Amino acid sequence: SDKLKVVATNSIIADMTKAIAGDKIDLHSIVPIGQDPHEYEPLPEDAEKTSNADVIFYNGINLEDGGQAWFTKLVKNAQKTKNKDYFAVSDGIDVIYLEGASEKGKEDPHAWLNLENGIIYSKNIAKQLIAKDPKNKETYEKNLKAYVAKLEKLDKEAKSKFDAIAENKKLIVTSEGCFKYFSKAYGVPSAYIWEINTEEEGTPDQISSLIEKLKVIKPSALFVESSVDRRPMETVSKDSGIPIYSEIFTDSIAKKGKPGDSYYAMMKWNLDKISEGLAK
Ligand SMILES: [Fe+3]
Known part of the structure; x- marks a missing residue:
């Protein structure tokens, strides 16, 4: 023992x-x-x-x-x-x-x-x-x-990852407002349905607020986290016409054996999927 x-x-x-x-x-x-x-x-x-x-x-x-x-x-x-x-x-x-x-x-x-x-x-x-x-x-x-x-090398990659994307396409949209640190570090603004996970998560007004924002700065993709109920972002996607490009990993790594199944892997997955989705 x-x-x-x-x-x-x-x-x-x-x-x-x-x-x-x-x-x-x-x-x-x-x-x-x-x-x-x-x-x-x-x-x-x-x-x-x-x-x-x-x-x-x-x-x-x-x-x-x-x-x-x-x-x-x-x-x-x-x-x-x-x-x-x-x-x-x-x-x-x-x-x-x-x-x-x-x-x-x-x-x-x-x-x-x-x-x-x-x-x-x-x-x-x-x-x-x-x-x-x-x-x-x-x-x-x-x-x-x-x-x-290894984390330092990925951090350097993250700092360049969105360089080829027009400023007017750079908005990361997720269910929870969980991207503040990423947005600050890597120069990609973020928007959300609800600000932090809690007990209600997905009022019509929150969805409408996001939909209205998406009319002003219109990204080519929305994203959905692996750890949230997808139904609210599905509504956002339906109402905005903007596709959910990929699941991403925020509050959890992926299940073992699937891509993203570590902190390093999930962050590499996020950088790839988010930059690819927004560049469409
Ligand atoms: Fe969270």
Whole structure:
């Protein structure tokens, strides 16, 4: 029973962790592939794994950790301590808030869509793996170094990826307003149906607001995330006449064995599909 026991809240963080740790650790990821990680009801296995974990990684910044959110209840019930047992892998990023907001609690969580934040998350993960499992420091550091270099290369690709697309075609449209960090990092504005995942997601007024916007700046493609109900964007597509070009990966990686089945793979998929769809 000597491997470090690690719990990650979702498949993106779990995949980054795997990239650093390989088979050195026993890793459990809570939110199933393709499920919303903002609001999830942990299963009996999840609570057991969390209680028995040596280290727990979560996104923070208002993904799963609001005062009434699922992860907060989870670690509370598991009697765990912040920055001893559980660590927000977003610590250190430049935080972007939900529109019009600036206060703690109203962060936009979707930082990993800027690859430079994926690097910060990875560095944070490696920092705690080394702190808690020093015997494997060599492996963690070696894997971190290779992984950061690979993410850096994709980041450079992302910075050029949309250069051939006319400014009046550059709008990424997704269901959730989850692209703020990508839009900032890579110079492609984004629009959405609802601003962050919550309990209602897809009022007629939200759909109408998006449809109206799509008349002013009219992209050649819409996109749909792998982790949301598609029906609202299908309505948007029907009403605008703009096709859904591809599924993309925002709040989850793809299922294992399918394209996009890692953080690196899902971001490469997004860059390819989004640039290809918008260039039509
Ligand atoms: Fe989200």
